[PDB]
Amino acid sequence: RPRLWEGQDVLARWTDGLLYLGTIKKVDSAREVCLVQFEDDSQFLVLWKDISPAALPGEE
Amino acid sequence: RPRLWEGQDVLARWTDGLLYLGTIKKVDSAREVCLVQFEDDSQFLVLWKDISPAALPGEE
Amino acid sequence: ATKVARKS
Amino acid sequence: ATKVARKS
């Protein structure tokens, strides 16, 4: 059973180093990327390693 | 300087046990709660201990 | 870790 | 630990 799936809410690491909340729209297992839709309805391909369905609160 | 402040984006733990992304609207250091506004524009009082400006992505 | 969610 | 953010 895959870690990531269509319709799942996830955090995704952006190019600015910050985590944004979005929703998976497509999962590509060959390239290990997902199309993620963000709160502003933008959509980008993000590597699986930079997507997480869960987070541990913590300090910098 | 305080850990939490107005206008800050944070994860907040909700009564369903899940983390939702919101923005701090008010800080109350006497009661150690913040008023947090969520993406549906709802606003609720949440204890400081359940608010985090930062997270470590991971697996449940 | 705790699952994240959006408002429904 | 990494800061979270909303779209601006």
Author numbering:
A (entry chain AA), B (entry chain AC): 28 to 87
C (entry chain B), D (entry chain A): 21 to 28
The authors write:
To elucidate the molecular basis for the recognition of H3tK27me3 by PHF1 and PHF19, we determined the crystal structures of PHF1-Tudor and PHF19-Tudor in complex with H3tK27me3, respectively. Taking the PHF1-H3tK27me3 complex as an example, A25 is stabilized by hydrophobic interactions with Leu45 and Tyr47. The amino group of A25 also forms a hydrogen bond with the Leu46 carbonyl oxygen, and the A25 carbonyl oxygen participates in a network of solvent-mediated hydrogen bonds with Leu48 and Glu66. The trimethylated K27 residue inserts into the aromatic cage, where the positively charged trimethyl ammonium group is surrounded by the aromatic sides of Trp41, Tyr47, Phe65, and Phe71. Asp67 and Ser69 also contribute to the K27me3 recognition by providing some polar interactions. Mutating Trp41, Tyr47, Phe65, or Glu66 of PHF1 to alanine disrupted or significantly decreased its binding to the H3tK27me3 peptide, whereas mutation of the more peripheral F71 displayed threefold weaker binding. In the PHF1-H3tK27me3 complex, V24 is coordinated by a hydrophobic leucyl patch comprising Leu38, Leu45, Leu46, and Leu48, and Leu38 and Leu45 form an L-L clasp interacting with H3t-V24. Compared to A24 in H3, the side chain of H3tV24 enables more extensive interactions with the PHF1 leucyl patch. The single point mutants L38A, L45A, or L46A of PHF1 exhibited ~two to threefold reduced binding affinities to H3tK27me3, and mutation of the more peripheral L48 also displayed slightly weaker binding. Compared to our complex structures, we found that both H3tK27me3 and H3K36me3 peptides reside within the same binding grooves of PHF1 and PHF19, but their backbones are reversed.
